[PDB]
Structure formats: structure tokens, C-alpha cells
Nucleic acid binder design. Structure first.
Ligand code: FES
Lengths: 48, 86, 58, 74, 23, 137, 97, 72, 122
RNA sequence: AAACUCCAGUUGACACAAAAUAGACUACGAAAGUGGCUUUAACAUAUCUGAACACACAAUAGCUAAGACCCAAACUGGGAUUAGAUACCCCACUAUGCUUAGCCCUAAACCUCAACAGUUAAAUCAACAAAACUGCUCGCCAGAACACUACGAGCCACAGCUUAAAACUCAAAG
């Protein structure tokens, strides 16, 4: 199952073909790793 | 410092109450350990001395927290004696 | 809570080095410390300086 | 101390004796000096509570054994 | 424990080191 | 509104003006409270010296400098010179745990200045240079 | 023998074991918001577990992540980022009382 | 006692009802043991499933007229 | 194995960031790396002033490069980023998603330690 | 006091030094030791014990070169104190602490409590300390002081280390 899962992911890896394309696409996104937590243990993610 | 100024260890003065602000500042510095650290950093405390002091303070916290817990546990029994006379 | 006392002192069962080295047995006493009197400090030094400054001017 | 009155009353009613108070040292092992040379000591001691007020055995439990007085105890 | 037995070796050693230095 | 003890964030918009000036623009009073001395320097928000006074400049010498009364007069002397240059509201930045840490602040307000904020800047190495050896007292 | 004797069971009234707030949640050095929750607003000092209320595992993880995030240019060191002074308070520490 | 498992479950689902325990009466029965008895009696029939049995018991005690709160 | 490049760039304009990002991604590939993804964490103000390559930086663009490379490629890529004057700071770490978090059972409060001293009357 | 006054105070730029908080945690290592971040490599033995005729290690301090220089600092010089002060206090500055490459092989290297396998039953149990013990093995001890000494021997150690006595003396030492 791992190799199966791995085989699917490789289709989206950055190769030299999809390099500039992926660099332009990446310059438009903004992934956030910030989330807060509460005293009851509930993840509070900033809305936008 | 490379950091921004007037952010760390900064307290705002309310209604010109300087005494109360400096007091809250002192508390923050003390509650975080800064005051005691600055005082111990005046002279070099050798590693043998540092370990003797940390052990002493940690033996002290245990005893102090265990006595405080026994005082708080027995505080209920300080009430008036119910069988006064016998 | 209270800090743990498990495997902190040098005992036969304890394999590791002692963490704590108490001078006196960690055993509660039946008394508590006497209230220590607060050390005194000079007082009215501000009002004194105000008065002493006017003397110098006048 | 919650039952000192009850136990003192009960002892009077059955014509017997009660010591529900602070037990002075030597009441049993030093009775001929604390009471008089011809005093008669109890032949039986009934403990309704066997611990003193610091949660330790009443001294009389040991002193009864030293004086060879049987004891009943809760 | 006192250090009365250390102090004997302490002086012995001190005198010996001074003696070696002199000679 | 709840009075906030946290200083105004520079970038963020704020309504707190003390003499029409934003928090960023208020001059700063730097206090160096040493074990044997106290030094006060008032600077503009752009780091322009305005007034300076220390316990030594007020005539105190040797151990008399290491007092609260000597630190207070320096606060009064610095306040007198700072008010001549147009200073009213000051931010205070204290450095050290000397005897004249609070007395100097007293001298400043006793001299007519108004403290809007207190900041501590005592240097704490994280770990740095090894301090001198202990005294055998 | 008799059927009314105590059955050798395990305690059915046993309460679920207390887990810390961060139990099962990946602590990441990039998540400065979470990390900032556990440091002093005034000195940026990391709080001990008696304040954070964390377990041994997650106190270490938070500690290690803060030290990494700070030196990699993600988290300030001498204070708590002024942007996070409004996050849910989760630490058992009071400066005014 | 085996009844303790049922008592625990009832306390977890419903908790101590408004009914105030009267420990002075030697024959006092609480709503918990009332619940338990029903549960135990229905087990005598031959039901070996807790899920189905619990749903029945909870409603069989409501047929007798009980005050229960399942969410808290 | 799997790594992550925490890449702080020099808060440039799109042509220059795209140029810089492309350099970095190729230099990884040039050393035997299989680049998995590129993430943009956005241009923030730096937590503190970073001095790099004779410049004082206050802002910078934050990026992440998820990639696989041979263990020997780490030292070579680390040194490469040292000489890029558009990188404010670059650190390579083991990917945080590679590690699997063990299931935790719960805080167990510590009972007071016992039998530390003999039960003799002192 | 001497000292500094090319000095102090804000601000900016700037380590080959040392590693607040976390740590009220008690983990790693054979011990020594190890608490800033990252990465690579990596933490012996599927019975146990076991080398003072062996090997590999071993804090601090030292030694041999070659570098580094913020601070701390034996020595030394001033200031002070004192009857004296070759100290304690102040200032200054060096070897030294750091790196590299070799040595040296010592500590209250002590948690003065050996490894392995077990037992809380008995009679626990001189005192104190960190409760009393069993099996098994190795290593050590046999009044004090002479003596961390002398001789001999080995050692990159030449004021060194490791092994290590005797004579005279005592009726105690502990
Ligand atoms: S209780 Fe599970 S991670 Fe702390």
C-alpha cells in the first residue's frame, strides 16, 4: 500500500519540466502553518 | 539587540501612576526569574556552587510546597472546639 | 502539584546518580518558621531632600 | 472527646469506672504512689477508642499489659 | 567526619613538596 | 475601553496621543542605575541628546553617589534641563538594579516630567562573558 | 461456593486518563502562533510545565521547536510577537494578581 | 460486584440524578439501582447484547416513569 | 532521505524571487535531489534584524522546499546557500512529517515517593 | 584610595569567547562527562562473573609546539588594611581557560556504598547514615604513626606518576 500511495504522489513532484510553471504557481499561494489552541484542546485556525 | 525596542519588559503607565507601573514591572521580572538571575550573574557562580544551590532550592521547594499543602489541608480544623469542656 | 521525589536521592535501588542532596531529611517538621521582622529603612528621605533643597536656595 | 460524656454516664449507670480524660503518666504503673499503697487497680479495662488524640495507641494499652490487666478493645 | 586524618597527609605532602623543591 | 499595559504597536494604528505625538515620537529617558552611581540621559525620539545628569555631576562623590537621594537629585537636574528643551512626556528605559533605579524616576517626575511607559533593559547574557570571581567577605 | 462474593474485576469507575491540550497534535517550528502561546509576553521566556500544563513529551517538543524557530528566523527571542498577544490564554500565570 | 459496571455506565451516560440518596433507610433503592435491576432482569431472558439491551432498559425505565438526561 | 529547506529570501520582486527560487531548486537537483514541492509562506517582517552578505535585512520571503536527497547532498547544499547573496537564511532539517507521533496515553500524576527514610524515631 | 579621563551615556556596525528561560524535567554515557540550533555518522555482547603480568579511555590543573584574544584570571605591580599582610578588599595585567597536533594519567575521579541473581520473611536492627538481608564471584583490608615516604622497577612522565617498605617511637589511634 505504501508503494501504491507513493506512486500516486510522484506524478506531482517538481521535475525540470514543471519547474518555472511550479515556481510561478508557488509564488501565488500562501500556505499557513499557524494555528492556536484553547484550554479545552481545540485547534483555532485564523480565518484568512 | 537586533530586536525591536519598547516591546520587551515594557509596561504602560496608567493615569500617571508611576509607582504602580514600576511595581508591576518588578513583578514581571521577578515572576520570570530575571531579577534573581541578574543578581546571581554579578559574580561567577562556579559549576560546583551552582549545583549545590540548585539542589538546595529544589529540596526547599519540595519542603515548602509540602508544608503549604499540609497547612492548607488542616486549615479547616482551626474552627472553634465543639466539645469544649470534655 | 509538588516536584517528584522518585529516583532523586542516592538510594540502593536507585541506579542513576542522585539529583538532590539534602542536608536534612526531607521530612515535614511539626513546627513552622517564626515570622521574621521586616528590616527597617530610613523614612521621609524625599520630604527631607525637599526641605534641605529650600534651605540651600534661601 | 465526642463521646466522653456518653462513656462517663454509661460507666456510672453500670456502677463501674471511666477514664475519658488526659491520662497522667503512671496511673497504672505508679498507682501505689499516685493513689495510696492499698489502692486496688482495675481487673479489666475496656477501650472504646484505642488511639489517643494524635492517632497513636493510648498509653494505657501498654501500661495495662505491663500491669497484667486484660483489656477489651474496639 | 572530621578532617584530622586528611590534615596529617596535607602537611606531610606540603613538607615533602617543599623538601623536593629545596633539594 | 480597557487600558492596555502592552505598549502601542508601532505599525498598527493607535489613538493614544499624549501631546499630539504618537508613542513612537515621545522622547526617551535612559536611566543607568549602577551599584555606585546613576546616570540619566534624555533623548528625543530620533536619538538626539537633550539633557544628561548623573549623581557625580550633582556634586556627590564616592559612596554618596550610590544612594537614592543622590539618584533623585540627578532626576531633578535632568528634568530641569529637559523641560528647557521642550520635553514633557518621556518614555523611561531603566538599565540595572542599582539603588537609584526608582529614585531617579522619582526625581524626573518631581522635576515636572510625565512618565507614560516604563521599560527595563538590564543586560542579561544568555549564557556570554564570564563575570568576575566571587568576593571573600 | 457462594455467588455473592466480590468479583475480581478491574475498576469500572476509572476515569479516562487526563491528556494534555496538545495531545495528538503535531508541534511544528513553523507554527509560531502555537509556540508563542507558551512564552512570556514580556521577556519571551519559555514557561515551565507547571504553567503550561503540558506533559513531558510535549513540553520538550515545544521547547525544542521554540529554540529551532527562534534561530531560523521565525520566532522572536526577547519578547512575544505583538501579533499574538490576543491568542487564547492557555498558561496558568497571572502578572496582575 | 458485576452490578458496578452497569452503575458506572449509568453514571457516565446520565450521571447522579436529582434523587438525593437516603443512606439512613436500610432498604433505600436509588434510580441507579432501579436502572440496574431492570438491566439485570432483562438479562435473565437471554439477551447477550449490551447495545440493544441498553436501549431497551433506558426506555423500559421510562415506561415506569423516570427523569433521565442522556446528553448530560 | 526527506528534508525541508527553510528558505528566507531577500524580499525582492517577482522576477528576482522567481530567479532565486529557480537557482535553489536546481542546485538541489544538481546534487541529486528529488524536489517534492515548493511552498510560499509569504513575505513577513523578520522577527529580528538579520545581517547577511553585508546587508541589514528587516523583511524577507519565507519559502519551503520539500525534497529527497542523498545524505551527502546536505553538506553540499548547505555550503551552496552560504554563497547565494539573495538568501537571508537557509536551514535544512529532516522533514517534520517523516516522524510518526506515538500515541500518548495521558498524564499520570506522580504519587509521593515512599520509603526514603527508615521508620525510626529520630 | 590608586586607576581611567583617546572616558562615560543613547544609537549603528560588528566573535575563533560562553551557551538566560525551558529544567518544578531526571534523560544519555563504561566512567570521566553531557543541557544554543542544523545535518552526517553513531550509542558492544540472546547466560553471568572475570586482567595490579594486557589493552582502550579518564574532570581540573600542567607540559610541547602553532594560532585565536571578549571576558575571567595564578604570578607580578600598584591602592588599601595591618604591629606585620609575602593574604582577605580595590585596580591593572600575564601564564592559563579556547582551537589544532602530541603528551601528562592525577581528584573528597565519593552517590566514600562492587557486578550478577534474589528476598521483606524472620530474630528488623551497636550508634549514625541512605532499613535488614540471601546466593555467587571478583577486587580490596587486618593497631597508630613513620608513609600519597625511602629503596627497587616501569613509564614520551626528570620538582612527575604507579607500585611501596623498614628501623627507632607509642598504648593508644580511630
Ligand atoms: S497527554 Fe498525550 S501528548 Fe501529552
Amino acid at each position: 500500500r505504501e508503494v501504491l500511495q507513493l506512486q500516486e504522489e510522484v506524478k506531482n513532484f517538481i521535475t525540470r519540466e514543471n519547474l518555472e510553471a511550479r515556481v510561478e504557481a508557488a509564488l501565488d499561494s500562501r500556505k499557513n502553518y499557524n494555528w492556536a489552541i484553547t484550554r479545552e484542546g481545540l485547534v483555532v485556525r485564523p480565518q484568512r | 539587540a537586533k530586536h525591536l525596542k519598547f516591546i520587551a519588559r515594557t509596561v504602560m503607565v496608567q493615569e500617571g501612576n508611576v509607582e504602580s507601573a514600576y511595581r508591576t514591572l518588578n513583578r514581571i521580572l521577578t515572576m520570570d526569574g530575571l531579577i534573581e538571575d541578574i543578581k546571581h550573574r554579578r559574580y561567577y557562580e562556579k559549576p560546583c556552587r551552582r549545583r549545590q544551590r540548585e539542589s538546595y532550592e529544589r529540596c526547599r521547594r519540595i519542603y515548602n510546597m509540602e508544608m503549604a499543602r499540609k497547612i492548607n489541608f488542616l486549615m479547616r480544623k482551626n474552627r472553634a472546639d465543639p466539645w469544649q469542656g470534655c | 502539584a509538588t516536584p517528584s521525589l522518585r529516583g532523586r536521592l542516592a538510594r540502593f535501588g536507585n541506579p542513576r546518580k542522585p539529583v538532590l542532596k539534602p542536608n536534612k531529611p526531607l521530612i515535614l517538621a511539626n513546627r513552622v518558621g517564626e515570622r521574621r521582622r521586616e528590616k527597617g529603612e530610613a523614612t521621609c528621605i524625599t520630604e527631607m531632600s525637599v526641605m534641605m533643597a529650600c534651605w540651600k536656595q534661601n | 472527646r465526642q463521646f466522653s460524656y456518653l462513656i462517663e454516664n454509661m460507666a456510672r449507670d453500670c456502677g463501674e469506672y471511666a477514664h475519658t480524660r488526659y491520662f497522667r503518666g503512671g496511673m497504672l504503673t505508679n498507682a501505689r504512689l499516685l493513689f495510696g499503697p492499698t489502692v486496688r487497680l482495675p481487673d479489666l479495662i475496656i477501650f472504646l477508642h484505642t488511639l489517643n488524640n494524635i492517632f497513636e495507641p493510648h498509653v494505657a494499652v501498654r501500661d495495662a499489659a505491663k500491669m497484667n490487666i486484660p483489656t477489651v478493645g474496639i | 567526619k572530621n578532617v584530622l586524618k586528611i590534615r596529617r597527609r596535607k602537611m606531610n605532602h606540603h613538607k615533602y613538596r617543599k623538601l623536593v623543591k629545596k633539594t | 475601553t480597557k487600558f492596555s499595559i502592552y505598549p502601542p504597536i508601532p505599525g498598527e494604528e493607535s489613538s493614544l496621543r499624549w501631546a499630539g505625538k504618537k508613542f513612537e515620537e515621545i522622547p526617551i529617558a535612559h536611566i543607568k542605575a549602577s551599584h555606585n552611581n546613576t546616570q540619566i540621559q534624555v533623548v528625543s525620539a530620533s536619538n538626539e541628546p537633550l539633557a544628561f545628569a548623573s549623581c557625580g555631576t550633582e556634586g556627590f562623590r564616592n559612596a554618596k553617589k550610590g544612594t537614592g537621594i543622590a539618584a533623585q537629585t540627578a532626576g531633578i537636574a535632568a528634568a530641569a534641563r529637559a523641560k528647557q528643551k521642550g520635553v514633557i512626556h518621556i518614555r523611561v528605559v531603566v538599565k540595572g538594579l542599582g539603588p537609584g533605579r526608582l529614585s531617579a524616576m522619582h526625581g524626573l517626575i518631581m522635576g515636572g516630567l510625565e512618565v507614560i511607559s516604563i521599560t527595563d533593559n538590564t543586560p542579561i547574557p544568555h549564557x556570554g562573558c564570564r563575570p568576575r570571581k566571587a568576593r571573600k567577605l | 461456593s457462594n455467588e455473592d462474593l466480590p468479583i475480581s474485576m478491574e475498576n469500572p469507575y476509572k476515569e479516562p486518563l487526563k491528556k494534555c491540550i496538545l495531545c495528538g497534535k503535531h508541534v511544528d517550528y513553523k507554527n509560531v502562533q502555537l509556540l508563542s502561546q507558551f512564552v512570556s509576553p514580556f521577556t519571551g521566556c519559555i514557561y515551565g510545565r507547571h504553567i503550561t500544563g503540558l506533559c513531558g513529551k510535549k513540553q520538550k517538543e515545544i521547547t525544542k521547536a521554540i529554540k529551532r524557530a527562534q534561530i531560523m528566523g521565525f520566532m522572536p527571542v526577547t519578547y512575544k510577537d505583538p501579533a499574538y498577544l490576543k491568542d487564547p490564554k492557555v498558561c496558568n500565570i497571572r502578572y496582575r494578581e | 460486584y458485576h452490578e458496578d459496571r452497569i452503575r458506572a455506565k449509568f453514571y457516565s451516560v446520565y450521571g447522579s440524578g436529582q434523587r438525593a440518596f437516603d443512606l439512613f433507610n436500610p432498604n433505600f433503592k436509588s434510580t441507579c439501582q432501579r436502572f440496574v435491576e431492570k438491566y439485570t432482569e432483562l438479562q435473565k431472558l437471554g439477551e447477550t447484547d449490551e447495545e440493544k439491551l441498553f436501549v431497551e432498559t433506558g426506555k423500559a425505565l421510562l415506561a415506569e416513569g423516570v427523569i433521565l438526561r442522556r446528553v448530560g | 532521505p526527506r528534508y525541508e529547506l527553510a528558505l528566507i529570501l531577500k524580499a525582492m520582486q517577482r522576477p528576482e524571487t522567481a530567479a532565486t527560487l529557480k537557482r535553489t531548486i536546481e542546485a538541489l537537483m544538481d546534487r541529486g535531489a528529488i524536489v517534492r514541492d515548493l511552498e510560499n509562506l509569504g513575505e513577513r517582517a523578520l522577527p529580528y534584524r538579520i545581517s547577511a552578505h553585508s546587508q541589514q535585512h528587516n523583511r524577507g520571503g519565507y519559502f519551503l522546499v520539500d525534497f529527497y536527497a542523498p545524505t551527502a547532498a546536505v553538506e553540499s547544499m548547505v555550503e551552496h546557500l552560504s554563497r547565494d547573496i539573495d538568501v537571508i537564511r537557509g536551514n535544512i532539517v529532516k522533514h517534520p512529517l517523516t516522524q510518526e507521533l506515538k500515541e500518548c496515553e495521558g498524564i499520570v500524576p506522580v504519587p509521593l515517593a515512599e520509603k526514603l527514610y527508615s521508620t525510626k524515631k529520630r
